[PDB]
Design an enzyme around this catalytic site. Structure first.
Site, PDB file in Angstrom:
ATOM      1  N   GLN A  64      50.176  58.166  60.130  1.00 11.71           N
ATOM      2  CA  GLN A  64      50.425  57.453  59.252  1.00 11.71           C
ATOM      3  C   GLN A  64      49.996  57.331  57.855  1.00 11.71           C
ATOM      4  O   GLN A  64      48.638  56.233  57.681  1.00 11.71           O
ATOM      5  CB  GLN A  64      51.012  56.009  59.657  1.00 11.71           C
ATOM      6  N   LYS A 107      59.598  54.419  64.574  1.00 11.28           N
ATOM      7  CA  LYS A 107      59.484  56.381  64.837  1.00 11.28           C
ATOM      8  C   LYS A 107      58.806  55.930  67.245  1.00 11.28           C
ATOM      9  O   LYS A 107      59.769  56.790  67.845  1.00 11.28           O
ATOM     10  CB  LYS A 107      58.269  56.745  64.535  1.00 11.28           C
ATOM     11  N   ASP A 112      53.792  65.825  61.112  1.00  9.44           N
ATOM     12  CA  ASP A 112      53.786  66.658  60.003  1.00  9.44           C
ATOM     13  C   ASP A 112      54.518  67.040  59.342  1.00  9.44           C
ATOM     14  O   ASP A 112      55.083  67.073  57.787  1.00  9.44           O
ATOM     15  CB  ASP A 112      52.590  65.219  59.151  1.00  9.44           C
TER      16      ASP A 112
HETATM   17  N1  LIG Z   1      51.919  60.155  57.556  1.00  4.95           N
HETATM   18  C1  LIG Z   1      53.110  59.982  57.450  1.00  4.95           C
HETATM   19  N2  LIG Z   1      53.317  58.990  56.805  1.00  4.95           N
HETATM   20  C2  LIG Z   1      54.277  58.427  56.060  1.00  4.95           C
HETATM   21  N3  LIG Z   1      54.081  57.317  55.153  1.00  4.95           N
HETATM   22  C3  LIG Z   1      55.604  59.832  56.220  1.00  4.95           C
HETATM   23  N4  LIG Z   1      57.112  58.336  55.532  1.00  4.95           N
HETATM   24  C4  LIG Z   1      57.379  57.772  56.468  1.00  4.95           C
HETATM   25  O1  LIG Z   1      56.922  57.306  57.635  1.00  4.95           O
HETATM   26  N5  LIG Z   1      58.600  57.476  55.193  1.00  4.95           N
HETATM   27  C5  LIG Z   1      59.240  55.964  55.940  1.00  4.95           C
HETATM   28  C6  LIG Z   1      60.274  55.801  57.628  1.00  4.95           C
HETATM   29  C7  LIG Z   1      61.168  55.375  58.156  1.00  4.95           C
HETATM   30  C8  LIG Z   1      61.475  54.711  57.252  1.00  4.95           C
HETATM   31  C9  LIG Z   1      62.765  53.962  57.370  1.00  4.95           C
HETATM   32  O2  LIG Z   1      62.625  53.410  59.523  1.00  4.95           O
HETATM   33  N6  LIG Z   1      63.506  52.969  56.603  1.00  4.95           N
HETATM   34  C10 LIG Z   1      64.398  52.444  57.472  1.00  4.95           C
HETATM   35  C11 LIG Z   1      63.927  51.386  57.268  1.00  4.95           C
HETATM   36  C12 LIG Z   1      64.266  50.457  55.793  1.00  4.95           C
HETATM   37  C13 LIG Z   1      63.392  48.782  56.305  1.00  4.95           C
HETATM   38  N7  LIG Z   1      61.516  47.892  55.499  1.00  4.95           N
HETATM   39  N8  LIG Z   1      61.869  46.947  55.323  1.00  4.95           N
HETATM   40  N9  LIG Z   1      62.618  46.857  55.991  1.00  4.95           N
HETATM   41  N10 LIG Z   1      64.030  47.758  56.518  1.00  4.95           N
HETATM   42  C14 LIG Z   1      65.908  52.727  55.740  1.00  4.95           C
HETATM   43  O3  LIG Z   1      65.380  53.083  54.864  1.00  4.95           O
HETATM   44  O4  LIG Z   1      66.768  51.967  56.088  1.00  4.95           O
HETATM   45  C15 LIG Z   1      61.179  54.881  56.108  1.00  4.95           C
HETATM   46  C16 LIG Z   1      60.030  55.497  55.323  1.00  4.95           C
HETATM   47 CL1  LIG Z   1      59.951  55.419  53.656  1.00  4.95          CL
HETATM   48  C17 LIG Z   1      55.449  60.236  56.999  1.00  4.95           C
HETATM   49  O5  LIG Z   1      56.573  60.809  57.386  1.00  4.95           O
HETATM   50  N11 LIG Z   1      54.303  60.632  57.495  1.00  4.95           N
END
Ligand SMILES: Nc1nc(N)c(NC(=O)Nc2ccc(C(=O)N[C@@H](CCc3nnn[nH]3)C(=O)O)cc2Cl)c(=O)[nH]1
Ligand SMILES: NC(=O)c1ccc[n+]([C@@H]2O[C@H](COP(=O)([O-])OP(=O)(O)OC[C@H]3O[C@@H](n4cnc5c(N)ncnc54)[C@H](O)[C@@H]3O)[C@@H](O)[C@H]2O)c1
Ligand SMILES: NC(=O)c1ccc[n+]([C@@H]2O[C@H](COP(=O)([O-])OP(=O)(O)OC[C@H]3O[C@@H](n4cnc5c(N)ncnc54)[C@H](O)[C@@H]3O)[C@@H](O)[C@H]2O)c1
Ligand SMILES: Nc1nc(N)c(NC(=O)Nc2ccc(C(=O)N[C@@H](CCc3nnn[nH]3)C(=O)O)cc2Cl)c(=O)[nH]1
Lengths: 290, 289
Positions: A97, A53, A120
């Site tokens: 997060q 992010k 969010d």
């Molecule tokens: N407050 C709050 N809390 C939260 N938890 C969330 N949710 C959230 O951030 N979700 C989230 C964001 C970015 C990824 C990402 O970057 N995905 C890459 C890399 C995968 C990888 N991982 N390791 N190696 N590769 C891919 O899927 O290609 C994946 C996820 Cl699940 C929110 O939005 N707000």
């Protein structure tokens, strides 16, 4: 064989749109946008996602800081930090997060973020406004799913959509955006949406997916979606991120690739879109248009 | 042949339960509850339904008033009356009967009712809390549909449910209640729920209802639901009220032969809407949430 939608390429486009929007905004004399992320504890996935992010923020001209706190932080201490940031006029977007430690109530935390900084879309007013199809800050992952479908040109109006999962931050907003009226303040997809979840028997899930023009899996279960469940030519959007032995989605990618018309990969699918849509929300918050 | 569920009879039972709760609230030294209803314009259906609400209020020992205004009232004038009633401590429940004229924004009106008095559950805070399965004031018609199912003992967990209709005050809350987790603060039904609407092709609607254990029609279209669309022994709940004589969305006589349960129109969901409003009003008077 299925078109493999690249979430990386789509997010690159979205991020370039945001960089342009931010630069025109700054060029006109406004303050550069600033995003604050609070990160609690040592969840390795959380740190990875938060870094993605803030890297994306830098690239599109949005300033940021990550404020990391130990998992031993108390709820009152987190609430104090949120209040200080709410009152910092330099901060346009603020997000905490998730997941948080068990002793902290996530709903109380999400409602403590000022709704105007709630990039969010997790504050109850933003949830309510979304569920009423009103102008709102859309949650990033459901919005990314929406954008994947729209920007690939996959129609939704009158089509059958199955969502696997009903979580309040992912599965439910996806079902909300896809079934609602294209003509409302915040347009929806006008699809026929089936919501399935942990008590949907496997056979009943298949009886609904086989009718589906679009299957969206947000359950966190490897191989929940297999080719026998998919209508030939359907679009399959894989939201899950599962550690198996390696990362995979909820979909049997290689099998479903043979029957679907479209499929997203994991990684590189929905994930990058989540990060990109947060950039959209951060410039929206800085402009204070809501 | 289908069990016909008397919404009228269920509602009357519920109203007796409210009457007892109200009488003990008063006998405990608390002020008698008071419901204010604002009625704008001359929609005959609206006038009839509000009368049923004020009749039911008298039945359960809740004081009430209907305040009728012409359709030409401005939004600011309606907002002023609402603010007056918000600040009247004698008023426990306050609702503005919908629909409102085009020049009045219903969402602004619904959000101007003080949340504590929002017996409709239409305030954005109540909507958001409901959509997060938190304690909330549930809207009367969806809660009545839920009560018909629960009090009849029709199971929902793991079952297939189709809702025809996606309106924010009826169809969307019904789908939200039925599909959500029974283990959350405000339990849901744990059903697999299909939401259909005006852009669902008739053929696709039938292909989902035919799998359904419960079909809930809130579209306002006569004969939307016919026996061929229903699987043997399913429960069919008719929320529509269409003037054609009043009929529901369901072909009552045809589906009657294949469904296991069915609600009639009139006398089905309608009376249940009024009874669940009475439940909300005593909840609002007690400052429960
Ligand atoms: N407050 C709050 N809390 C939260 N938890 C969330 N949710 C959230 O951030 N979700 C989230 C964001 C970015 C990824 C990402 O970057 N995905 C890459 C890399 C995968 C990888 N991982 N390791 N190696 N590769 C891919 O899927 O290609 C994946 C996820 Cl699940 C929110 O939005 N707000
Ligand atoms: N950007 C992204 O790609 C992205 C973003 C957010 C979340 N995710 C992923 O989405 C997944 C779920 O996350 P969450 O926070 O929504 O999880 P959660 O555990 O809160 O919810 C998972 C949902 O799956 C449902 N479910 C369980 N078993 C099921 C079954 N057999 N059939 C259908 N549904 C079933 C549950 O009822 C629940 O609603 C995880 O893999 C998470 O990492 C990905
Ligand atoms: N207590 C009660 O009995 C009660 C309470 C409220 C409303 N109602 C009745 O419910 C009906 C609808 O009420 P509303 O407030 O939701 O009205 P509305 O006009 O706002 O909504 C109508 C809904 O039906 C959907 N729809 C239209 N055509 C459809 C089709 N062919 N297939 C599936 N869905 C279709 C529309 O998309 C929309 O979501 C009316 O008859 C109304 O009087 C009854
Ligand atoms: N703020 C606000 N605005 C709203 N519009 C609503 N919704 C609402 O009031 N619904 C409603 C309430 C009662 C009836 C009823 O009494 N039905 C009877 C009698 C049929 C009849 N009517 N005329 N002649 N016969 C029957 O069904 O048998 C029917 C309906 Cl639709 C609300 O809840 N809050």
């Amino acid at each position: 064989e299925a078109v493999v939608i690249s979430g990386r390429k789509l997010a690159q486009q979205i991020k370039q749109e945001v960089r342009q929007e931010v630069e025109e905004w700054v060029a006109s004399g406004n303050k550069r946008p600033h995003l604050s992320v609070i990160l609690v504890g040592e969840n390795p996935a959380s740190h990875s996602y938060v870094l993605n992010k803030t890297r994306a923020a830098a690239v599109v001209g949005i300033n940021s800081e990550t404020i990391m706190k130990p998992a031993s932080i108390s709820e009152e201490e987190l609430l104090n930090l949120i209040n200080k940031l709410n009152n910092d006029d330099n901060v346009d977007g603020l997000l905490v997060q998730l997941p948080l430690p068990e002793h902290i109530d996530e709903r109380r935390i999400c409602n403590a973020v000022s709704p105007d900084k709630d990039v969010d879309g997790f504050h109850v007013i933003n949830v309510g406004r979304m569920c009423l199809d009103q102008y709102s800050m859309l949650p990033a992952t459901p919005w990314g799913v929406w954008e994947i479908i729209k920007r690939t040109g996959i129609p939704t109006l009158g089509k059958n959509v199955v969502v696997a999962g009903r979580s309040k931050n992912v599965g439910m907003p996806i079902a909300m955006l896809l079934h609602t009226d294209g003509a409302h303040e915040r347009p929806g997809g006008d699809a026929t949406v089936t919501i399935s979840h942990r008590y949907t028997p496997k056979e009943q899930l298949k009886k609904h997916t086989i009718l589906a023009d679009i299957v969206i899996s947000a359950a966190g279960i490897p191989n929940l979606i297999t080719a026998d469940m998919i209508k030939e030519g359907a679009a399959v959007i894989d939201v899950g991120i599962n550690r198996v032995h390696k990362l995979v989605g909820d979909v049997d990618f290689e099998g479903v690739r043979q029957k679907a018309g479209y499929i997203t990969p994991v990684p590189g699918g929905v994930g990058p879109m989540t990060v990109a849509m947060l950039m959209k929300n951060t410039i929206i918050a800085a402009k204070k248009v809501l």
